Ligand binder design. Structure first.
Ligand code: PB7
Length: 387
């Protein structure tokens, strides 16, 4: 799998993309990797923020399905036209697949200026595909037409510092291993949690610690009304109630300095002198995930290097600046790229389960490192899922 290594590019704020080809002759496009949706979709018409797009009239292998699709994301939406075409992944498995493609004709707050991607790859399951679950998602088509194992894995790689467009261009953003686990991408052991149901990549959080201290809520609250691993979300997003007590406990640990309320809302930046960011003063966060064996459990631990998202100083100065990447949600927990950056995340679809190991890729300091650790027994653990 050395072919697929380093095939990703981008950053958490604007998503990580892979190079794919679309149609005959091969039309090259950068495609956002999204484990939190199920639609394969590309821009098909000129757009302010697009430097290239899908041209069906120029593809001999394109097929019109004569059907409209509208996909509303949590923030952003697009209207498109259903069709299939032959699709390949240049820095992926050497295969070609006819797969459903949504040709995006209209869009609002979807495309991002200077992001460098022109499409989205919905890696999740049919159940959440639009317009309905009869639209076979890409990875399904891929797995059904080829010999590639029902398995893919993601190493999303934060820099720990801001990237101007030409740097995101030139930097390695991580890896997408289609059909395997690459052992050079992680250090330590691989811990698996079960996928609760095959719509989103749904998992169950059993317990939450801020600097080892229990948030001590009814565990159900952590998975209200679901908890998903989502490539296409920046933040770690938590249910109103969970966010509240997580932000209270985090504010507590960080008393030393005080910050604008706008910072905690993910709305205002915060800046320190170059190299001066006080990582030690900010707490670690541990998430306990239901284990494979009964009553077993494991935890993933993230540092402020993960949940404090770097952004460029608008000022001329050399300040290191950040936005708080933990935000309120009314649709459940979303373990975004911010978390995913800490780990090598294995999507073992074949075995209906998600793996976690410490990323060779993750940002840390000298005193702390991100962790995946276990097992944990004491855990009162079954009623944690929401119905
Ligand atoms: C890659 C990050 C991206 C650049 C973005 N950056 C920032 C800084 O906000 C912008 C959008 N966004 C979040 C919302 C954040 C947010 C949340 C609340 C308020 C403000 C911002 C999101 O909606 N992402 C989409 C994919 C996507 C990628 C790029 C553009 C649009 C969508 C997921 O697929 C949704 N999964 C749940 C889901 C929900 C419904 C139907 C579903 O099935 C079809 C699946 C991000 O993190």
């Amino acid at each position: 799998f050395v072919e697929m290594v380093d095939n990703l590019r981008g950053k958490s704020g604007q998503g990580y993309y892979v190079e794919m080809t679309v149609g005959s002759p091969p039309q090259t496009l950068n495609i956002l990797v999204d484990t939190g949706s199920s639609n394969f979709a590309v821009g098909a018409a000129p757009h302010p923020f697009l430097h290239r797009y899908y041209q069906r009239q120029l593809s001999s292998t394109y097929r019109d399905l004569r059907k409209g699709v509208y996909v509303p994301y949590t923030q952003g939406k697009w209207e498109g036209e259903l069709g299939t075409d032959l699709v390949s992944i240049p820095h992926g498995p050497n295969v070609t697949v006819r797969a459903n493609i949504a040709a995006i004709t209209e869009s609002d707050k979807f495309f991002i200026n200077g992001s460098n991607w022109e499409g989205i790859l919905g890696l999740a399951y049919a159940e959440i595909a639009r317009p309905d679950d009869s639209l076979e998602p890409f990875f399904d088509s891929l797995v059904k037409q080829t010999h590639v194992p029902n398995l893919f894995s993601l190493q999303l790689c934060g820099a720990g510092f801001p990237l101007n467009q030409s740097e995101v261009l030139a930097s390695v953003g991580g890896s997408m291993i289609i059909g395997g686990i690459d052992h050079s991408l992680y250090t330590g052991s691989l811990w698996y949690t079960p996928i609760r149901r095959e719509w989103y990549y749904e998992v169950i959080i059993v317990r939450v610690e801020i600097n080892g201290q229990d948030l001590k809520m009814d565990c159900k609250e952590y998975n209200y009304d679901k908890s998903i691993v989502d490539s296409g979300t920046t933040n770690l997003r938590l249910p109103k109630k969970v966010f509240e007590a997580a932000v209270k406990s985090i504010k507590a640990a960080s008393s030393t300095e005080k910050f604008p309320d706008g910072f905690w809302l993910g709305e205002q930046l915060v800046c320190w002198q170059a190299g001066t960011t006080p990582w030690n003063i900010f707490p670690v966060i541990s998430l306990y995930l239901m284990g494979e064996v009964t009553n077993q459990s494991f935890r993933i631990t993230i540092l402020p290097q993960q949940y404090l998202r770097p952004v460029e100083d608008v000022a001329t100065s050399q300040d290191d600046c950040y936005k708080f990447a933990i935000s309120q949600s009314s649709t459940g927990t979303v373990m975004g790229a911010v978390i995913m950056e800490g780990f090598y995340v294995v999507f073992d679809r074949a075995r209906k389960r998600i793996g976690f190991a410490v990323s060779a890729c993750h940002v840390h300091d000298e005193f702390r490192t991100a962790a995946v650790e276990g097992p944990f027994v004491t855990l009162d653990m079954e009623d944690c899922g929401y119905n």
